[PDB]
Write a protein that binds this ligand. Structure first.
Ligand SMILES: *[C@@H](C(=O)O)[C@H](O)C(=O)N[C@@H](CC(C)C)C(=O)NCCCCNC(N)=[NH2+]
Ligand SMILES: [Ca+2]
Length: 215
């Protein structure tokens, strides 16, 4: 794998969204990974709809939370997911209103990254594209993060609670990092992004629940 990669630079990443108060981080994380694969396979960069996943992925619990693997499994079974235009985010649970006419991507399965393995994660990011991951996002320091490579020793790898998107990795000031796209709006962090310490004993559990959709 290359020393660094940044998928934002290749145009594989849509703009930063804002999930609001709904517990739908898992939906934003999922469409982020599907959006990456869509661009890589078609050349089109398009917003896919997290609302579609929130209302329809019945293995999950809407605004009460969910998993990305369950979301990819839904898109495969359903034979598609709508675009954001065809199924707009409203930040609260509604009945399923999927319309195949608005279908913008498909999914033929998903793959998990070996638990805790940051090197497999790096290679997945290098080979595949943006990868859905989960972290401990509960610390005050994460929430008020503004710039630099994030590291806080109180972060708990066994307390995953927030799903994000790994869109690259690199190194700043001799500190290795992952480039992480969050869903708290473009004002948060560095334009809605965060560089999180890489190769520091799986900090924040970034490699504990990673996965990506097959397309
Ligand atoms: C994340 C967020 O909006 O900030 C959001 O609360 C979320 O979904 N968290 C996940 C945990 C990460 C993906 C590690 C969540 O808590 N999943 C478990 C939800 C409980 C499942 N219930 C049903 N019926 N499946
Ligand atoms: Ca499942």
């Amino acid at each position: 794998a290359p020393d660094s990669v940044d998928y934002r630079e290749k145009g594989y990443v849509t703009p930063v969204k804002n999930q609001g108060q709904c517990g739908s981080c898992w939906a934003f994380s999922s469409v982020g990974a599907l959006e990456g694969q869509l661009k890589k396979k078609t050349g089109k960069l398009l917003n896919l709809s997290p609302q579609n996943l929130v209302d329809c992925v019945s293995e999950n619990d809407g605004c009460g939370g969910g998993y990305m693997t369950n979301a990819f499994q839904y898109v495969q079974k359903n034979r598609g997911i709508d675009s954001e235009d065809a199924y707009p985010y409203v930040g609260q649970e509604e009945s399923c209103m999927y319309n195949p006419t608005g279908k913008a991507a498909k999914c033929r399965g998903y793959r998990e990254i070996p638990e805790g393995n940051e090197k497999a994660l790096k290679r997945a990011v290098a080979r595949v594209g943006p990868v859905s991951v989960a972290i401990d996002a509960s610390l005050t320091s994460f929430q008020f993060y503004s710039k630099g490579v994030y590291y806080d020793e109180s972060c708990n790898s066994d307390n995953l609670n927030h799903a994000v998107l790994a869109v690259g990795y690199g190194e700043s000031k001799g500190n290795k990092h992952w480039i992480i796209k969050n869903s708290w709006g473009e004002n948060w962090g560095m334009g809605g992004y965060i560089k999180m310490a890489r190769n520091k004993n799986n900090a924040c559990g970034i490699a504990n629940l990673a996965s990506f959709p097959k397309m």
